[PDB]
Symmetry: C2
Subunit: 292 residues, 2 copies
């Protein structure tokens, strides 16, 4: 099943721009060990935008391969076109993915009715669980709760990743959708309370540098042990803010390279963490016990 701490995995690049399979294998091993519950391969954090179509499947497959099915693999396959949305998804299903994360259409701002027709079609063309992703902070698009209720009732759409960071939003949604539709967190800062409200997981960025603490945090929350959930979330707060000191995944990539897990390497337009933000971030990793 799909729940708990899910890492939105970064996809490493060597200095000249290619994919480092060694590293990806290290990361998978790393999360596989320290307690991660799932892996969101090739997502926003995965730097999908700048990926090739071939590089896309070559990865989804490699992770599934290395997971031995010990853990579920969620693949990003959302496009702002209905057509490539269906295509990318057909791919993830072949590569061996267990479910897909699809972003609401960016740049072209649908109608709510358009969003509904968009996702519905994609759900009737590829038999595989689908997880809706809402983030107007990037798509210049907000999928309202009515449009969410309406889609939650479609055959193989099993949940939603909510990034707005607005708790009242994720509370109107839990209310409007059924008992087995799953609402996940997008915002790492507020994930804990979203779970305490009835959430079922966090599609985390911080989990990249601190997977084990995130597993713990999700356990405490989904049990209703708010006392503990918040204790950990506080000792991570420094991290949650530092990793967005510059657009994701520019910061988290850097931290990962600092721990010796991934090489310096990120594709244009994204750039490498500005010197500006080195001390501020490095200190956080120290405050956090990921680096001394």
């Amino acid at each position: 099943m799909i729940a708990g701490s899910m890492v939105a995995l970064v996809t490493p690049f060597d200095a000249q721009g290619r994919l480092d399979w060694d590293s990806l294998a290290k990361l998978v091993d790393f999360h596989l060990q320290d307690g991660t519950n799932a892996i969101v391969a090739v997502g926003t954090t995965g730097e999908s935008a700048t990926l090739d179509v071939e590089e896309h499947i070559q990865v989804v497959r490699r992770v599934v391969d290395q997971v031995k099915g010990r853990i579920p693999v969620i693949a990003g396959t959302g496009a702002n076109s209905t057509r490539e949305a269906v295509a990318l998804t057909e791919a993830a299903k072949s590569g061996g993915a267990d479910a897909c994360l699809l972003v609401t259409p960016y740049y072209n701002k649908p109608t709510q009715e358009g969003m509904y027709q968009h996702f519905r079609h994609i759900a009737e063309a590829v038999a595989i669980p689908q997880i809706l992703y809402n983030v107007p902070g990037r798509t210049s698009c907000d999928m309202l709760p009515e449009t969410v209720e309406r889609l939650s009732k479609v055959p193989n759409i099993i949940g939603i990743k909510e990034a707005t960071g607005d708790l009242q939003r994720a509370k109107e949604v839990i209310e409007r959708v059924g008992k087995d539709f799953l609402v996940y967190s997008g915002d790492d800062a507020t994930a804990v309370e979203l779970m305490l409200l009835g959430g079922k997981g966090n599609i985390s960025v911080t989990a990249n540098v601190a997977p084990r603490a995130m597993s713990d945090l999700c356990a405490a929350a989904m049990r209703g042990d708010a006392a503990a959930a918040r204790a950990i979330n506080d000792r991570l707060m420094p991290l949650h803010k530092a990793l967005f000191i510059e657009s994701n995944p520019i910061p988290v990539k850097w931290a990962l390279h600092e721990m010796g897990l991934i090489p310096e390497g990120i594709r244009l337009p994204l750039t490498w963490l500005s010197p500006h933000c080195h001390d501020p971030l490095r200190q956080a990793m120290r405050q956090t016990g990921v680096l001394a």
Copy 2:
């Protein structure tokens, strides 16, 4: 050298979704005859997000073919992947296009520095004039005037399509760049005042349904007839509003179909103009003399 009424040309589809060469030809004769100063194919209005690449050079070709060097043909070519961008520009060039319109990387949220190295890379790579495109409301990112400044000093980058609709941002860009770097309006409602400030043209949407009137507006505003320009704009406001009553391409197509210039066909995730919006837009087209 490329200035004035410029049409963000739509891209005809038939009820089934396929392209309608019969209709594109007419739209081109319409603006040809009526006096549009340049055509911008495959832009946001041209539904650039839902065209296979193959479909995208095909379109440019048959427009370039038909214009036959009479007026400038500008091709929309921006991707949020720098690699994918040089690819589309290379294609547009090798299409016969005269220049390219490139939108800032949407959804992936570049730093100002990344935005900079993104555009120079492309200007370095493809020997063809390039016109920047800033439109935050659709991208969720934003090219500070301070970055446009740096960029204006690069060889084959000769202008920007500023679409914030903020008239101070304009009073700003114009002040920071040389007179040979041209600032275009990307917002129809206020394009008249931006030209009065030193702007040289309006990549317009209204122009699809009222090309002659837009030339007249652009001409008077560029000579200095501030009284004449605002009088024409005042006469066209209801239409500027009506064309954006539901998110862009949608309204303008409905209009065009009503004039009998294009098929009822628009690709998902975009939907056909919802029923409510029919009489507020039909009356506008009438209140402003394009419909009887």
